[PDB]
Amino acid sequence: TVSAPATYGNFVLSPENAVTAISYHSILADFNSYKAHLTSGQPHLPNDS
Amino acid sequence: TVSAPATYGNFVLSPENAVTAISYHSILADFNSYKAHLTSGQPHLPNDS
């Protein structure tokens, strides 16, 4: 007997993604994590989007 | 006698500007105001950047 995810995973646009979508036709996922770890001066992230 | 601004105006870019400049090579000034007013649905800004 094995454990499996009972439902699909949900991925959604944060508003900072939507504004970049409108402006430059592009989104970087997990945007706030990128900005926080960039301004904090740290190279590596805990998880991918 | 007339009043004048005593010092140059110090304008600095927010971290979202930094990450957008790194990624797409572009910046929207007063970026957080754009995000908040766009998401809230307010059509107009009080002042320019």
Side-chain angles (χ1 to χ4, degrees):
Chain A
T1 61
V2 300
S3 301
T7 186
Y8 297 109
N10 187 359
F11 177 59
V12 74
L13 277 296
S14 68
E16 49 250 46
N17 306 129
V19 65
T20 63
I22 297 300
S23 74
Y24 321 132
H25 300 273
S26 187
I27 297 89
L28 183 148
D30 212 16
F31 188 90
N32 61 6
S33 183
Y34 272 54
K35 80 193 180 191
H37 279 282
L38 185 57
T39 191
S40 185
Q42 301 191 56
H44 297 157
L45 299 175
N47 266 300
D48 186 31
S49 73
Chain B
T1 53
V2 54
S3 312
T7 315
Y8 296 99
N10 180 14
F11 161 50
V12 293
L13 73 165
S14 70
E16 292 90 350
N17 311 131
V19 57
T20 43
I22 291 302
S23 60
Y24 311 133
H25 304 261
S26 179
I27 297 172
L28 308 185
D30 203 11
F31 183 91
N32 310 302
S33 75
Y34 274 40
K35 185 187 76 176
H37 277 289
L38 179 154
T39 307
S40 306
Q42 192 68 29
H44 286 60
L45 273 297
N47 53 27
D48 62 270
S49 297

XYZ file of all heavy atoms in Angstrom:
736
model
N 0.851 -1.181 0.000
C 0.000 0.000 0.000
C 0.889 1.234 0.000
O 1.766 1.371 0.859
C -0.931 0.016 1.215
O -0.150 0.047 2.416
C -1.816 -1.220 1.223
N 0.663 2.128 -0.958
C 1.519 3.289 -1.153
C 0.690 4.555 -1.015
O -0.528 4.553 -1.221
C 2.232 3.250 -2.522
C 3.104 2.010 -2.624
C 1.217 3.284 -3.651
N 1.362 5.643 -0.657
C 0.727 6.941 -0.482
C 0.955 7.793 -1.723
O 2.075 7.887 -2.228
C 1.279 7.651 0.755
O 1.062 6.877 1.922
N -0.115 8.414 -2.212
C -0.062 9.199 -3.435
C -0.800 10.506 -3.200
O -1.679 10.567 -2.331
C -0.687 8.441 -4.616
N -0.473 11.567 -3.950
C -1.222 12.820 -3.794
C -2.638 12.695 -4.334
O -2.843 12.392 -5.513
C -0.388 13.830 -4.590
C 0.313 13.012 -5.615
C 0.591 11.680 -4.965
N -3.623 12.928 -3.466
C -5.020 12.685 -3.807
C -5.574 13.674 -4.822
O -6.661 13.433 -5.357
C -5.879 12.721 -2.544
N -4.870 14.767 -5.104
C -5.395 15.785 -6.000
C -4.243 16.513 -6.677
O -3.087 16.411 -6.261
C -6.285 16.788 -5.257
O -6.879 17.689 -6.199
C -5.463 17.583 -4.253
N -4.579 17.245 -7.735
C -3.583 18.025 -8.451
C -3.034 19.135 -7.562
O -3.714 19.635 -6.661
C -4.189 18.627 -9.720
C -4.652 17.601 -10.728
C -6.003 17.385 -10.961
C -3.737 16.855 -11.454
C -6.428 16.448 -11.884
C -4.151 15.917 -12.380
C -5.498 15.717 -12.591
O -5.915 14.784 -13.512
N -1.789 19.515 -7.821
C -1.163 20.636 -7.140
C -1.599 21.945 -7.774
O -1.771 22.030 -8.990
N -1.777 22.963 -6.936
C -2.309 24.248 -7.373
C -1.169 25.252 -7.500
O -0.404 25.456 -6.552
C -3.369 24.756 -6.394
C -4.073 26.007 -6.890
O -3.765 26.530 -7.961
N -5.030 26.491 -6.108
N -1.065 25.875 -8.670
C -0.099 26.930 -8.935
C -0.855 28.149 -9.445
O -1.728 28.027 -10.310
C 0.950 26.464 -9.954
C 1.944 27.521 -10.339
C 2.737 28.128 -9.380
C 2.103 27.890 -11.664
C 3.659 29.095 -9.734
C 3.022 28.855 -12.026
C 3.802 29.459 -11.059
N -0.529 29.323 -8.906
C -1.344 30.513 -9.126
C -0.435 31.724 -9.286
O 0.711 31.731 -8.829
C -2.354 30.714 -7.971
C -1.647 31.212 -6.717
C -3.480 31.655 -8.385
N -0.956 32.750 -9.960
C -0.213 33.982 -10.189
C -0.302 34.889 -8.968
O -1.400 35.274 -8.554
C -0.758 34.716 -11.414
C -0.328 34.341 -12.835
C 1.157 34.585 -13.060
C -0.707 32.915 -13.168
N 0.845 35.228 -8.388
C 0.882 36.323 -7.435
C 0.787 37.651 -8.191
O 1.150 37.727 -9.367
C 2.159 36.270 -6.598
O 3.305 36.544 -7.381
N 0.282 38.708 -7.547
C 0.083 39.975 -8.278
C 1.359 40.549 -8.875
O 1.314 41.136 -9.969
C -0.512 40.906 -7.211
C -0.154 40.288 -5.902
C -0.115 38.812 -6.133
N 2.497 40.400 -8.192
C 3.759 40.854 -8.763
C 4.112 40.073 -10.020
O 4.856 40.570 -10.873
C 4.880 40.747 -7.729
C 4.948 39.408 -7.015
C 4.542 39.508 -5.558
O 3.515 40.157 -5.271
O 5.253 38.943 -4.699
N 3.600 38.847 -10.152
C 3.722 38.136 -11.419
C 2.812 38.740 -12.481
O 3.197 38.845 -13.650
C 3.405 36.653 -11.233
C 4.228 36.010 -10.142
O 3.696 35.348 -9.253
N 5.539 36.199 -10.208
N 1.598 39.137 -12.093
C 0.634 39.656 -13.061
C 1.102 40.978 -13.657
O 0.933 41.229 -14.858
C -0.734 39.818 -12.399
N 1.674 41.849 -12.825
C 2.139 43.139 -13.329
C 3.272 42.950 -14.335
O 3.305 43.609 -15.383
C 2.532 44.065 -12.160
C 3.714 43.514 -11.394
C 2.833 45.465 -12.673
N 4.205 42.035 -14.052
C 5.258 41.742 -15.018
C 4.703 41.059 -16.262
O 5.231 41.257 -17.361
C 6.346 40.878 -14.379
O 5.789 39.618 -13.984
C 6.943 41.578 -13.166
N 3.647 40.256 -16.111
C 2.981 39.672 -17.270
C 2.454 40.759 -18.194
O 2.636 40.701 -19.416
C 1.835 38.768 -16.816
N 1.793 41.761 -17.619
C 1.247 42.846 -18.424
C 2.368 43.674 -19.043
O 2.293 44.072 -20.211
C 0.301 43.716 -17.578
C -0.902 42.893 -17.111
C -0.159 44.925 -18.370
C -1.731 42.330 -18.243
N 3.430 43.936 -18.278
C 4.451 44.874 -18.735
C 5.399 44.243 -19.749
O 5.559 44.762 -20.860
C 5.230 45.416 -17.538
O 6.112 44.432 -17.028
N 6.043 43.125 -19.393
C 7.115 42.568 -20.209
C 6.809 41.175 -20.747
O 7.730 40.501 -21.227
C 8.429 42.520 -19.421
C 8.670 43.711 -18.526
C 9.066 43.540 -17.206
C 8.522 45.006 -19.003
C 9.294 44.623 -16.385
C 8.743 46.094 -18.188
C 9.133 45.898 -16.881
O 9.361 46.982 -16.068
N 5.556 40.727 -20.681
C 5.149 39.439 -21.246
C 5.955 38.280 -20.660
O 6.341 37.347 -21.368
C 5.266 39.450 -22.775
C 4.416 40.485 -23.446
N 3.107 40.254 -23.806
C 4.693 41.753 -23.831
C 2.611 41.335 -24.381
N 3.553 42.260 -24.408
N 6.218 38.330 -19.355
C 6.982 37.264 -18.720
C 6.709 37.226 -17.223
O 6.412 38.249 -16.603
C 8.485 37.429 -18.971
O 9.205 36.302 -18.499
N 6.819 36.024 -16.652
C 6.687 35.799 -15.216
C 7.823 34.913 -14.736
O 8.150 33.904 -15.371
C 5.335 35.156 -14.830
C 4.161 36.070 -15.171
C 5.327 34.736 -13.368
C 3.647 35.872 -16.539
N 8.418 35.289 -13.609
C 9.324 34.423 -12.871
C 8.569 33.870 -11.668
O 8.069 34.637 -10.839
C 10.578 35.189 -12.448
C 11.685 34.437 -11.713
C 13.034 35.043 -12.055
C 11.450 34.499 -10.220
N 8.484 32.546 -11.578
C 7.688 31.907 -10.542
C 8.356 32.048 -9.177
O 9.577 32.186 -9.064
C 7.464 30.431 -10.871
N 7.528 31.996 -8.129
C 7.975 32.204 -6.749
C 8.732 33.523 -6.622
O 9.856 33.581 -6.118
C 8.820 31.027 -6.257
C 8.665 30.784 -4.769
O 7.694 31.305 -4.181
O 9.509 30.070 -4.189
N 8.094 34.596 -7.095
C 8.777 35.869 -7.303
C 9.259 36.476 -5.988
O 10.392 36.973 -5.901
C 7.828 36.818 -8.034
C 8.461 38.097 -8.492
C 9.049 38.173 -9.742
C 8.443 39.226 -7.694
C 9.622 39.344 -10.183
C 9.015 40.404 -8.130
C 9.603 40.462 -9.378
N 8.413 36.452 -4.953
C 8.785 37.068 -3.683
C 9.955 36.349 -3.023
O 10.802 36.992 -2.395
C 7.575 37.123 -2.745
C 7.012 35.749 -2.417
O 7.574 34.721 -2.797
N 5.892 35.729 -1.704
N 10.023 35.022 -3.154
C 11.180 34.294 -2.646
C 12.457 34.738 -3.350
O 13.496 34.929 -2.704
C 10.971 32.790 -2.810
O 12.049 32.060 -2.252
N 12.393 34.913 -4.674
C 13.558 35.397 -5.405
C 13.977 36.778 -4.926
O 15.164 37.017 -4.685
C 13.286 35.427 -6.909
C 13.592 34.135 -7.629
C 13.036 32.933 -7.216
C 14.457 34.118 -8.717
C 13.317 31.752 -7.881
C 14.743 32.945 -9.384
C 14.174 31.765 -8.962
O 14.463 30.594 -9.624
N 13.020 37.698 -4.769
C 13.396 39.046 -4.352
C 13.978 39.045 -2.942
O 14.968 39.737 -2.672
C 12.201 40.002 -4.458
C 11.198 39.940 -3.317
C 9.907 40.667 -3.651
C 8.929 40.594 -2.488
N 7.570 41.068 -2.864
N 13.404 38.242 -2.038
C 13.884 38.211 -0.661
C 15.287 37.624 -0.580
O 16.172 38.202 0.061
C 12.915 37.417 0.214
N 15.517 36.482 -1.232
C 16.839 35.869 -1.164
C 17.866 36.643 -1.980
O 19.069 36.532 -1.719
C 16.773 34.411 -1.613
C 16.303 33.478 -0.541
N 17.124 33.042 0.476
C 15.093 32.913 -0.316
C 16.444 32.240 1.275
N 15.209 32.144 0.816
N 17.424 37.425 -2.966
C 18.356 38.273 -3.696
C 18.803 39.450 -2.840
O 20.004 39.680 -2.666
C 17.713 38.755 -4.996
C 18.610 39.570 -5.927
C 19.844 38.766 -6.289
C 17.850 39.977 -7.178
N 17.848 40.194 -2.272
C 18.214 41.363 -1.479
C 18.899 40.961 -0.176
O 19.697 41.729 0.373
C 16.984 42.232 -1.204
O 17.399 43.491 -0.660
C 16.036 41.553 -0.225
N 18.602 39.762 0.335
C 19.266 39.287 1.543
C 20.704 38.856 1.282
O 21.468 38.675 2.235
C 18.477 38.129 2.157
O 19.040 37.729 3.393
N 21.087 38.689 0.018
C 22.437 38.284 -0.319
C 22.745 36.834 -0.008
O 23.780 36.530 0.593
N 21.857 35.928 -0.413
C 22.064 34.503 -0.209
C 21.924 33.768 -1.534
O 21.028 34.080 -2.331
C 21.069 33.944 0.817
C 21.164 34.610 2.182
C 20.364 33.884 3.246
O 20.556 32.692 3.477
N 19.464 34.607 3.903
N 22.791 32.790 -1.801
C 22.847 32.192 -3.142
C 21.785 31.139 -3.431
O 21.311 31.042 -4.567
C 24.251 31.580 -3.178
C 24.504 31.194 -1.760
C 23.846 32.262 -0.918
N 21.398 30.347 -2.433
C 20.597 29.153 -2.671
C 19.282 29.216 -1.910
O 19.226 29.705 -0.778
C 21.373 27.891 -2.282
C 22.617 27.680 -3.089
N 23.672 26.913 -2.644
C 22.972 28.136 -4.313
C 24.625 26.907 -3.560
N 24.225 27.641 -4.582
N 18.198 28.696 -2.563
C 16.786 28.609 -2.233
C 16.449 27.248 -1.631
O 17.120 26.251 -1.916
C 15.933 28.826 -3.488
C 16.070 30.174 -4.194
C 15.267 30.176 -5.480
C 15.627 31.304 -3.285
N 15.413 27.175 -0.790
C 15.039 25.867 -0.228
C 14.353 24.951 -1.227
O 14.644 23.749 -1.254
C 14.111 26.244 0.935
C 13.517 27.547 0.524
C 14.588 28.269 -0.250
N 13.449 25.480 -2.049
C 12.668 24.650 -2.956
C 12.413 25.403 -4.252
O 12.422 26.637 -4.292
C 11.332 24.230 -2.325
C 11.406 22.878 -1.646
O 11.711 21.869 -2.280
N 11.112 22.850 -0.351
N 12.185 24.640 -5.317
C 11.767 25.206 -6.587
C 10.255 25.423 -6.590
O 9.517 24.841 -5.791
C 12.178 24.293 -7.745
C 11.899 24.908 -9.104
O 11.962 26.150 -9.220
O 11.606 24.151 -10.053
N 9.797 26.279 -7.508
C 8.376 26.605 -7.585
C 7.530 25.371 -7.874
O 6.411 25.243 -7.364
C 8.140 27.669 -8.656
O 8.282 27.122 -9.955
N 12.567 87.432 -1.841
C 13.127 86.153 -1.429
C 12.191 85.027 -1.840
O 10.966 85.176 -1.800
C 13.366 86.112 0.082
O 12.162 86.476 0.769
C 14.478 87.077 0.469
N 12.774 83.896 -2.234
C 12.012 82.784 -2.783
C 12.548 81.492 -2.185
O 13.734 81.379 -1.866
C 12.082 82.777 -4.331
C 13.530 82.794 -4.802
C 11.318 81.598 -4.923
N 11.658 80.518 -2.020
C 12.003 79.212 -1.478
C 12.408 78.282 -2.614
O 11.834 78.343 -3.705
C 10.823 78.622 -0.703
O 10.282 79.573 0.198
N 13.405 77.439 -2.361
C 13.905 76.488 -3.343
C 14.233 75.192 -2.623
O 14.462 75.207 -1.409
C 15.149 77.029 -4.064
N 14.273 74.053 -3.337
C 14.640 72.796 -2.671
C 16.103 72.777 -2.258
O 17.000 72.968 -3.085
C 14.326 71.732 -3.729
C 14.461 72.444 -5.026
C 13.999 73.856 -4.773
N 16.345 72.553 -0.964
C 17.687 72.678 -0.410
C 18.656 71.628 -0.938
O 19.860 71.895 -0.997
C 17.633 72.602 1.116
N 18.170 70.449 -1.319
C 19.048 69.348 -1.686
C 18.461 68.603 -2.876
O 17.252 68.649 -3.118
C 19.249 68.386 -0.502
O 19.488 69.143 0.689
C 20.444 67.473 -0.738
N 19.334 67.928 -3.626
C 18.889 67.059 -4.707
C 17.893 66.032 -4.184
O 17.918 65.652 -3.011
C 20.083 66.344 -5.345
C 21.080 67.254 -6.028
C 22.249 67.640 -5.388
C 20.861 67.711 -7.321
C 23.167 68.465 -6.012
C 21.772 68.537 -7.952
C 22.923 68.910 -7.294
O 23.832 69.731 -7.919
N 17.011 65.574 -5.069
C 16.012 64.582 -4.716
C 16.582 63.181 -4.837
O 17.006 62.762 -5.915
N 16.566 62.458 -3.720
C 17.169 61.129 -3.629
C 16.108 60.099 -4.000
O 15.193 59.823 -3.220
C 17.725 60.884 -2.230
C 18.372 59.519 -2.087
O 18.647 58.841 -3.076
N 18.618 59.108 -0.847
N 16.237 59.530 -5.195
C 15.318 58.517 -5.699
C 16.072 57.197 -5.802
O 17.103 57.120 -6.481
C 14.747 58.936 -7.056
C 14.161 57.804 -7.857
C 13.249 56.928 -7.290
C 14.520 57.623 -9.183
C 12.711 55.891 -8.030
C 13.986 56.589 -9.927
C 13.080 55.721 -9.350
N 15.559 56.166 -5.135
C 16.198 54.856 -5.084
C 15.187 53.797 -5.502
O 13.981 53.955 -5.285
C 16.761 54.548 -3.680
C 17.911 55.487 -3.352
C 15.665 54.653 -2.631
N 15.683 52.719 -6.106
C 14.819 51.674 -6.638
C 14.606 50.556 -5.622
O 15.509 50.200 -4.860
C 15.399 51.109 -7.938
C 16.636 50.206 -7.909
C 16.785 49.486 -9.240
C 17.897 50.994 -7.595
N 13.391 50.009 -5.619
C 12.973 48.954 -4.710
C 13.496 47.593 -5.171
O 13.903 47.435 -6.325
C 11.449 48.940 -4.612
O 10.865 48.485 -5.820
N 13.510 46.592 -4.281
C 14.031 45.269 -4.678
C 13.311 44.642 -5.860
O 13.949 43.944 -6.661
C 13.865 44.425 -3.403
C 12.939 45.199 -2.520
C 13.159 46.635 -2.852
N 11.999 44.858 -5.994
C 11.304 44.353 -7.172
C 11.851 44.983 -8.445
O 11.969 44.304 -9.473
C 9.799 44.598 -7.051
C 9.119 43.782 -5.961
C 9.093 44.491 -4.621
O 9.773 45.529 -4.481
O 8.392 44.008 -3.707
N 12.216 46.267 -8.390
C 12.883 46.891 -9.527
C 14.203 46.197 -9.833
O 14.537 45.977 -11.002
C 13.120 48.377 -9.259
C 11.879 49.085 -8.769
O 11.915 49.813 -7.778
N 10.772 48.879 -9.466
N 14.964 45.845 -8.795
C 16.248 45.185 -9.005
C 16.071 43.836 -9.690
O 16.763 43.526 -10.669
C 16.974 45.019 -7.669
N 15.142 43.016 -9.190
C 14.971 41.689 -9.776
C 14.395 41.786 -11.185
O 14.794 41.024 -12.076
C 14.120 40.790 -8.856
C 12.780 41.422 -8.570
C 13.943 39.410 -9.472
N 13.478 42.729 -11.431
C 12.962 42.903 -12.785
C 14.040 43.400 -13.740
O 14.062 42.994 -14.906
C 11.772 43.862 -12.786
O 12.050 44.977 -11.931
C 10.516 43.153 -12.299
N 14.931 44.279 -13.277
C 16.030 44.741 -14.118
C 16.989 43.603 -14.439
O 17.487 43.495 -15.565
C 16.765 45.892 -13.432
N 17.272 42.752 -13.453
C 18.159 41.616 -13.688
C 17.533 40.646 -14.684
O 18.203 40.147 -15.596
C 18.506 40.919 -12.359
C 19.392 41.821 -11.498
C 19.196 39.588 -12.615
C 20.684 42.227 -12.170
N 16.236 40.369 -14.531
C 15.591 39.364 -15.370
C 15.311 39.894 -16.774
O 15.813 39.349 -17.764
C 14.298 38.885 -14.708
O 13.397 39.962 -14.521
N 14.510 40.956 -16.877
C 13.961 41.366 -18.165
C 14.623 42.623 -18.719
O 14.293 43.046 -19.833
C 12.453 41.594 -18.031
C 11.730 40.454 -17.352
C 10.806 40.697 -16.344
C 11.968 39.138 -17.718
C 10.140 39.660 -15.719
C 11.311 38.095 -17.096
C 10.396 38.360 -16.101
O 9.737 37.323 -15.483
N 15.533 43.239 -17.955
C 16.208 44.482 -18.342
C 15.227 45.650 -18.446
O 15.291 46.444 -19.386
C 16.994 44.329 -19.650
C 18.005 43.225 -19.629
N 19.344 43.448 -19.390
C 17.875 41.893 -19.833
C 19.995 42.299 -19.440
N 19.126 41.340 -19.707
N 14.312 45.760 -17.486
C 13.386 46.884 -17.468
C 12.895 47.122 -16.047
O 12.951 46.236 -15.191
C 12.203 46.655 -18.414
O 11.303 47.746 -18.358
N 12.412 48.342 -15.807
C 11.947 48.773 -14.492
C 10.686 49.612 -14.656
O 10.617 50.482 -15.529
C 13.024 49.589 -13.742
C 14.265 48.742 -13.461
C 12.467 50.158 -12.442
C 15.422 49.542 -12.909
N 9.690 49.351 -13.811
C 8.567 50.262 -13.617
C 8.743 50.959 -12.274
O 8.646 50.319 -11.222
C 7.228 49.526 -13.662
C 6.920 48.612 -14.847
C 5.497 48.084 -14.746
C 7.127 49.349 -16.160
N 8.996 52.265 -12.312
C 9.219 53.016 -11.083
C 7.941 53.081 -10.254
O 6.827 53.012 -10.783
C 9.718 54.424 -11.405
N 8.114 53.224 -8.938
C 7.017 53.119 -7.973
C 6.260 51.806 -8.157
O 5.029 51.781 -8.231
C 6.072 54.322 -8.065
C 5.296 54.553 -6.783
O 5.637 53.924 -5.759
O 4.344 55.361 -6.799
N 7.024 50.714 -8.241
C 6.500 49.419 -8.664
C 5.436 48.894 -7.705
O 4.412 48.347 -8.136
C 7.673 48.444 -8.776
C 7.310 47.080 -9.278
C 7.357 46.801 -10.633
C 6.971 46.066 -8.401
C 7.047 45.546 -11.106
C 6.658 44.806 -8.869
C 6.701 44.547 -10.223
N 5.667 49.047 -6.398
C 4.718 48.541 -5.412
C 3.373 49.247 -5.512
O 2.326 48.613 -5.333
C 5.296 48.688 -4.005
C 6.699 48.124 -3.890
O 6.929 46.944 -4.151
N 7.646 48.968 -3.492
N 3.377 50.553 -5.788
C 2.119 51.266 -5.979
C 1.371 50.734 -7.194
O 0.146 50.565 -7.150
C 2.372 52.764 -6.130
O 2.892 53.054 -7.415
N 2.093 50.465 -8.287
C 1.469 49.849 -9.453
C 0.819 48.525 -9.083
O -0.349 48.285 -9.405
C 2.500 49.635 -10.565
C 2.718 50.823 -11.474
C 2.752 52.116 -10.973
C 2.894 50.646 -12.842
C 2.953 53.200 -11.809
C 3.095 51.721 -13.683
C 3.124 52.996 -13.163
O 3.326 54.070 -14.000
N 1.558 47.661 -8.383
C 1.020 46.354 -8.011
C -0.232 46.495 -7.154
O -1.263 45.864 -7.427
C 2.087 45.546 -7.274
C 1.677 44.121 -6.940
C 2.714 43.449 -6.056
C 2.624 43.950 -4.622
N 3.569 43.236 -3.720
N -0.166 47.338 -6.121
C -1.278 47.453 -5.182
C -2.511 48.057 -5.842
O -3.625 47.548 -5.668
C -0.858 48.284 -3.970
N -2.339 49.138 -6.606
C -3.485 49.780 -7.239
C -4.066 48.904 -8.342
O -5.285 48.879 -8.550
C -3.083 51.152 -7.777
C -3.098 52.230 -6.739
N -4.266 52.723 -6.197
C -2.091 52.899 -6.131
C -3.977 53.656 -5.308
N -2.663 53.782 -5.248
N -3.209 48.178 -9.064
C -3.685 47.271 -10.101
C -4.505 46.135 -9.502
O -5.579 45.794 -10.011
C -2.488 46.741 -10.893
C -2.650 45.747 -12.044
C -1.479 45.890 -12.996
C -2.729 44.310 -11.549
N -4.011 45.530 -8.418
C -4.741 44.424 -7.807
C -6.029 44.903 -7.147
O -7.065 44.232 -7.236
C -3.855 43.703 -6.792
O -2.624 43.326 -7.420
C -4.547 42.454 -6.273
N -5.988 46.062 -6.484
C -7.175 46.567 -5.801
C -8.251 47.011 -6.784
O -9.430 47.081 -6.422
C -6.795 47.721 -4.874
O -5.768 47.336 -3.977
N -7.869 47.315 -8.023
C -8.806 47.783 -9.020
C -8.906 49.287 -9.154
O -9.675 49.765 -9.998
N -8.165 50.044 -8.354
C -8.173 51.495 -8.482
C -7.521 51.896 -9.801
O -6.421 51.423 -10.112
C -7.441 52.140 -7.308
C -7.649 53.641 -7.192
C -9.074 54.002 -6.817
O -9.765 53.232 -6.150
N -9.519 55.177 -7.244
N -8.156 52.758 -10.600
C -7.615 53.055 -11.935
C -6.494 54.078 -11.951
O -5.667 54.039 -12.872
C -8.837 53.590 -12.686
C -9.623 54.273 -11.610
C -9.473 53.386 -10.393
N -6.431 54.982 -10.977
C -5.534 56.124 -11.038
C -4.593 56.142 -9.841
O -4.930 55.663 -8.754
C -6.322 57.439 -11.087
C -6.978 57.703 -12.406
N -7.906 56.849 -12.960
C -6.842 58.728 -13.280
C -8.313 57.335 -14.119
N -7.682 58.474 -14.337
N -3.388 56.711 -10.062
C -2.342 56.975 -9.089
C -2.422 58.417 -8.602
O -2.870 59.303 -9.336
C -0.955 56.726 -9.694
C -0.359 55.316 -9.647
C -0.155 54.864 -8.208
C -1.217 54.321 -10.410
N -1.995 58.689 -7.366
C -2.022 60.084 -6.894
C -0.986 60.961 -7.574
O -1.280 62.120 -7.894
C -1.760 59.945 -5.389
C -0.998 58.671 -5.258
C -1.537 57.756 -6.322
N 0.217 60.443 -7.808
C 1.281 61.220 -8.424
C 2.198 60.294 -9.207
O 2.197 59.076 -9.016
C 2.074 62.017 -7.377
C 2.594 61.149 -6.241
O 2.827 59.952 -6.403
N 2.780 61.760 -5.077
N 2.980 60.890 -10.104
C 3.960 60.135 -10.866
C 5.144 59.751 -9.979
O 5.236 60.136 -8.810
C 4.436 60.942 -12.073
C 5.136 62.225 -11.677
O 4.449 63.259 -11.536
O 6.371 62.200 -11.505
N 6.063 58.977 -10.555
C 7.204 58.474 -9.802
C 8.287 59.523 -9.584
O 9.107 59.364 -8.672
C 7.810 57.266 -10.514
O 6.885 56.196 -10.581
